[PDB]
Design a binder for these strands. Sequence first.
DNA 1: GAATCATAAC
Length: 180
Amino acid sequence: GSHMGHWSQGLKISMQDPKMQVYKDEQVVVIKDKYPQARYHWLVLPWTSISSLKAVAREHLELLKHMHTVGEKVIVDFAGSSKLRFRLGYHAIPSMSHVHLHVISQDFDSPCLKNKKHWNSFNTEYFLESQAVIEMVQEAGRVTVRDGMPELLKLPLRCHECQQLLPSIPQLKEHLRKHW
DNA sequence: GAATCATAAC
Ligand SMILES: Nc1ncnc2c1ncn2[C@@H]1O[C@H](COP(=O)(O)O)[C@@H](O)[C@H]1O
Ligand SMILES: [K+]
Ligand code: NA
Ligand SMILES: [Zn+2]
């Protein structure tokens, strides 16, 4: 198949779709995550094309901080009255091209959370905190990630609120109800 | 049987 039409390039299309955009400025766009992993799940993307955190340098430091600020503004404007906790961050090994910041509520109440990979990609070191990535670019000048990230996606399910271990996705979903 | 697992998508 074509490069432009490959599944991995899908964010490049969505980020230009008015129906998916929730905020735009001179630097970034915010879209709804197409397969959200919680009640509120947005992606913040710069207009400028940066393939992934591997291509990030200090020239992009203001941009990463702006993406974070914009993420926090979307939370306030769209979910401020909700009592929800949010995290902002990056997958250590993304699947989709074009750097994108995840802005995600911590209920994890969603039909798109279907497997252990989904869970662990938001609930282990595989989810790099936005602030951590920002600080690493500032102090080290580039983003590095340790070996062994794929193995994290296979860890036993553990609740992010109370650390209880759960034997299955259905049982995890039932358990998470208690933390609403 | 329900759920998970790895694999496959030409
Ligand atoms: N066309 C699309 N528009 C918006 N979000 C998408 C699209 N395709 C995939 N996604 C989401 O993009 C994220 C890609 O994951 P990752 O590359 O691991 O950061 C996931 O949260 C997907 O649900
Ligand atoms: K199995
Ligand atoms: Na992947
Ligand atoms: Zn719990």
